Design a protein around this ligand. Structure first.
Ligand SMILES: CCCCCCCCCCCCC/C=C/[C@H](O)[C@H](N)CO
Ligand SMILES: CCCCCCCCCCCCC/C=C/[C@H](O)[C@H](N)CO
Lengths: 296, 246, 96, 48, 50, 246, 296
């Protein structure tokens, strides 16, 4: 009342209507019949890409069409069913031989190591989902042999194992999976465990403050809200079992939510965490032709 | 009736005679962090007139063989005005932006600029070294250029591996020297956290690429500058302590 | 529950004296008395308290904390202190 | 950080060296996430 | 010295906003704290000739 | 029940165990400039959490033969914090203040400080030259001391001709080392104009005079410091332009 | 609604009650009878000056008093009737002789030149009032002689006269008073003409920005909202009238409002605009006695 420039905007800064309402689209859109229209001033073909909006010239407004009760399905295009298929994520090599007196293997959980799934899950900038992990484990030749294995999950902070029979393997608190090599692959479900509200595959910034160099800026882009710990694997034994072992990990993304789409990468990958490429060999997205007006 | 337009924020205003539209990024206005999404318990600060205004960066001269420029936000506004001071004194920053890029030219010049925003515009090191200990990484001044803004080295890949063709999925707008002379984009706060730092993480980046190169006949004006102006909208700051530049 | 904080965790400070920060009549004003980081998961003072030994059994923590400062000086001795928690950024301040 | 606001004023025949006990605790909005094996204990062999 | 812990909450000390805290506390109950199996004892059965 | 007290402003708090009262200067709280009294047409800015907090200046050591100190407001807060930045970027400034001066001492020390505020504390040149062209005038650093604060030369006349005895008509408070250990004063915006500049005109000045000199027996603590802390309340700024320090 | 820390204070930052209500006091306060009170815990004599509040121990609470219907008046203590008495402000000397070929006199309007009224109107910091000016004009000997005079008011900005018969004296816009030397003093009424909302006699600050020296800081404290122009005086003639003239100005302050009282100056004045004094001769407010316990 005494001063009202402060109340006039406080009661005007509520949720501003940004109507972009969507509708439940079960099947693809049909079409409606259209005759010829010889009219001036109403031009659906003339657009303006400079407005940042895509053309809305539909079929009925341009050519004479019939009507079709389109019954085609669109369910296989939702991101849920797009990421619902498991793919390779990481492979560990456990050489428990006489010359390799380690006994355990360790894998930093990072799905950016194999391009097949990285290329998909990097077309979106912010993703939030639950994963379904499946561990197949074979020998180097691909054989199964009745040796019991232990997979331990080491979240960020816990002590990583230091030996085949170290105390860390007691897994009093860490989740762990004991399974034999001659059993179905071990499958578990992991939730959205990031401290943030969504995983981000691109983090345009630095983790910490301070002076940042210009020669080896090895810390740029590395977001900590992504690193989710470590995966340790061993064979349950006191003495070495002479065998070469190989554990492959597959992850399924369920209950997915994606945000801020992104162009799909064209140049090949060179690094795991960084989106590096080479300016010497720029692989153009379109294959080359002989001439422009000679469509093959 | 639709070519003319006037934006006004704080104590500043922008006119335009040939720009025809206002691209609202992702169909959402900049708003304050609602209580159901806030994590910080302290009370933030909301000047709304000291920082919410149109800051005009320097001008970049469009040459016949230019390659494009990029800016980072809110990196550019970290040393200018009360926005710069609030961002240097506060730890948690949140705000949307209103971009406006002007590049006027006579009705005889020709060319087209692509003005887009790239949420989380992570740059890339251009080099074929595959070991992570010797691989080249972009320097600090190349990734956070500042108010000056940096230039591209190969815009066909946006210095980020991704092709420029699909970059149109981003909130974008063309500057076609035959129809319009400036492009404007209202972008909200795009981040995976309610608030974030203003000196470490840059929410997004602005991209200006001369797709159709500048071309003109002899005698016309050769100095065709590009000017960008930015207005932080619905800004909040929190976590006050001593001033840290970076 | 409040539990004591090994804030005087320096060398040559063996025994129970780790739980005591000293206070003395300073001839120079604006002087620093003590400092420590407020990360319970970090090693240091918080490593002794209960919240800091039980926050290590979990990975991520959230919520505010509190720090109680009890004075164990004489009754006739008075004074004033300034307890300042500085959010992240640069290192600890130089002057107050 | 704990700074000397003014000083530690003391009358005669009273010790000029005192101590302060710092105690820490969590507030009422404290909460925790995924469990984890602590790193404060170490064991080599079984406790026989 | 009263043996009671401080009750100084946030609102009473600094100017705070309001937050509809939706964080979970279920993983802190002792039920879910001890619900994870751990090693207890190991026996060595050497059924050899010696 | 009345000795204990806690003030809280912004992200800062002040406790006290022996101070007993809160002197509200002239019985008026700091408030915003109502529309019926405003002259500037532009919209001001009101952070209210970035600037409204307790800034603690340096400490002044009370000696056995000290002479008193004075500060100018808002001169002290022109280089510190977001208050300093707002005052350097804005032309029109308006705010009330909350002063709190602490000087603790054992129950064996004795002395009394007078802590007062002098609206428009015009200082004077100490000299008998009567021609206005050769008369001595106080230097800039003597009249606007800054965060450091300046000392008196003859406090019996408050360096302004007027006697110190009648200075009790001002909003004041004693610090008597036998009863209280800190004095606090809430003063509103006292000026003949709705807003005013923050770098040219200082609304008022703070005065700390050791009337009853410090006296103690041998063995006690000799270093008895005085600390002042200030909280600008209900602050407004207007007229934004480039930063001008002075 | 969505964010309510912004509404909770906007609708809480209204006019805060600062109750200090006064009452219409016509006459001085009487007294009420009081007997002796032998009670514990209720002590009106014990005060605490450290609270910044003055003692409230009245008469009835300390000694046994009678009742008196005090009929004394308090009207002569109001600031209205305190400043309602005119006093000398400035005196100009117009020597229109043969050796002084100027013909006009000029006076910068500044009431801080004579201590009698300055000492009064400087006990308050902010004053707002209307003035009533009265000009007596005599010769150097105190004689009146039938010579017509012109007093012109030159506000800040107008051109000041340059000669006895210059064009500025046309006073087409400037107010002017033509009066004969043998007439009653010329009296006019002037309003509150400051650009600010109140005159301030103490302005702790500088008029302009910029670097301020430390040797000759001649610009400190000089507020422009006080300087209200200039007063020019001449004798209406084309040739010189050989006489020494002296014009005295008296001002009455009516419809007065004062603000922020101030200690009354003790040391003598040395400068007009500045409150200078001398540290060598500090005139103590109280006269000296022989001993302390020897009240004269
Ligand atoms: C005993 C079970 C062990 C297997 C379960 C291990 C926990 C899996 C946590 C997965 C975290 C989310 C998926 C990972 C995403 C990306 O790799 C990171 N954001 C960084 O690349
Ligand atoms: C023809 C009539 C001439 C006489 C009238 C002249 C105008 C008088 C204006 C008086 C302005 C208010 C009173 C002056 C106050 C102080 O002198 C100034 N604030 C500075 O000292």
């Amino acid at each position: 009342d005494p001063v009202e420039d402060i109340i006039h905007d406080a009661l005007s800064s509520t949720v501003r209507r940004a109507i972009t309402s969507g509708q439940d689209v079960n099947t693809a859109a049909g079409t409606a019949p259209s005759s010829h229209r010889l009219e001036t001033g109403r031009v659906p073909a003339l657009q303006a890409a400079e407005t940042g909006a895509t053309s809305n010239a539909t079929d009925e407004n341009m050519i004479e069409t019939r009507c079709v009760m389109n019954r085609n399905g669109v369910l296989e295009a939702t991101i849920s069913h797009f990421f619902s298929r498991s793919g390779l994520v990481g492979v560990v090599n456990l050489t428990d031989g006489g010359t390799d007196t380690t006994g355990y293997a360790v894998w930093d959980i990072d799905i950016m190591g194999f391009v097949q799934l990285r290329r998909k899950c990097e077309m979106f900038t912010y993703m939030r989902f639950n994963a379904e992990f499946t561990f197949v484990t074979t020998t180097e030749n691909g054989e199964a042999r009745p040796f019991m294995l232990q997979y331990m999950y080491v979240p960020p902070g816990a002590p990583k194992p230091t030996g085949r029979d170290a105390f860390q393997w007691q897994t009093a608190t860490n989740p762990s999976v004991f399974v034999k090599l001659t059993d179905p692959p071990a499958q578990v479900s992991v939730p959205f465990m990031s401290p943030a509200s969504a995983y981000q595959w691109f983090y345009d910034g630095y983790p910490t403050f301070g002076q940042h160099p210009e020669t080896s800026n090895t810390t740029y882009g590395q977001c900590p809200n992504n690193m989710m710990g470590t995966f340790a694997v061993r064979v349950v034994s006191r003495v070495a079992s002479q065998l070469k072992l190989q554990t492959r990990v597959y992850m399924k993304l369920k209950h997915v939510r994606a945000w801020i789409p992104r162009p799909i990468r064209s140049q090949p990958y060179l690094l795991k965490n960084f989106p590096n490429y080479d300016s010497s060999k720029i692989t153009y997205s379109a294959r080359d032709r002989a001439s422009i007006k000679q469509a093959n | 009736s639709d070519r003319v337009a006037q934006l006004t924020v704080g104590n500043s205003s922008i006119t335009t005679q040939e720009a025809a539209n206002i691209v609202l990024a992702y169909g959402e206005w900049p708003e304050y962090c609602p209580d159901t999404d806030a994590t910080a318990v302290d009370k933030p600060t909301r000047p709304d007139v000291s920082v919410n205004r149109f800051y005009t960066l320097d001008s970049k001269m469009w040459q016949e063989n230019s390659t494009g420029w990029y800016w980072k936000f809110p990196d550019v506004l970290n040393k200018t005005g009360v926005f710069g001071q609030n961002a240097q004194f506060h730890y948690l920053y949140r705000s949307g932006f209103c971009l406006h890029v002007q590049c006027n030219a006579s009705k005889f010049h020709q060319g087209a600029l692509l003005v887009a925003v790239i949420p989380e515009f992570v740059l890339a090191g251009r080099g074929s070294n595959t070991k992570p200990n010797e691989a080249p990484h972009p320097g600090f001044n190349t990734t956070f250029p500042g108010t000056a803004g940096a230039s591209f080295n190969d815009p066909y890949v946006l210095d980020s591996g991704v092709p420029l063709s699909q970059s149109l999925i981003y909130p974008h707008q063309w500057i076609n020297l035959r129809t319009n002379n400036c492009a404007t984009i209202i972008v909200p706060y795009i981040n995976a956290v309610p608030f974030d730092s203003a000196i470490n993480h840059s929410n997004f980046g602005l991209i200006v690429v001369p797709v159709s190169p500048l071309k003109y006949s002899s005698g016309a004006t050769t100095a065709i500058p590009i000017t960008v102006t930015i207005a932080p909208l619905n800004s909040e700051f929190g976590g006050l302590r001593q001033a840290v530049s970076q | 529950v409040e539990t004591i904080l090994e804030v005087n965790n320096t060398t040559d400070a063996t025994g129970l004296n780790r739980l005591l920060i000293p206070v003395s009549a300073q001839n120079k004003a604006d002087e620093l008395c003590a400092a420590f980081m407020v990360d319970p998961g970090r090693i240091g003072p918080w490593q002794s308290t209960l919240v800091g030994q039980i926050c290590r059994y979990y990975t991520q923590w959230s919520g505010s904390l509190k720090v109680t400062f009890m004075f164990t000086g004489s009754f006739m001795a008075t004074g004033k202190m300034l307890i300042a928690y500085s959010p992240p950024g640069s290192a600890q301040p130089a002057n107050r | 950080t704990l700074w000397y606001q003014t000083n530690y004023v003391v009358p005669p025949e009273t010790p000029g060296e005192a101590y302060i006990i710092a105690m820490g605790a969590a507030q009422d909005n404290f909460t925790l996430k995924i469990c984890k094996d602590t790193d404060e204990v170490t064991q080599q062999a079984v406790l026989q």
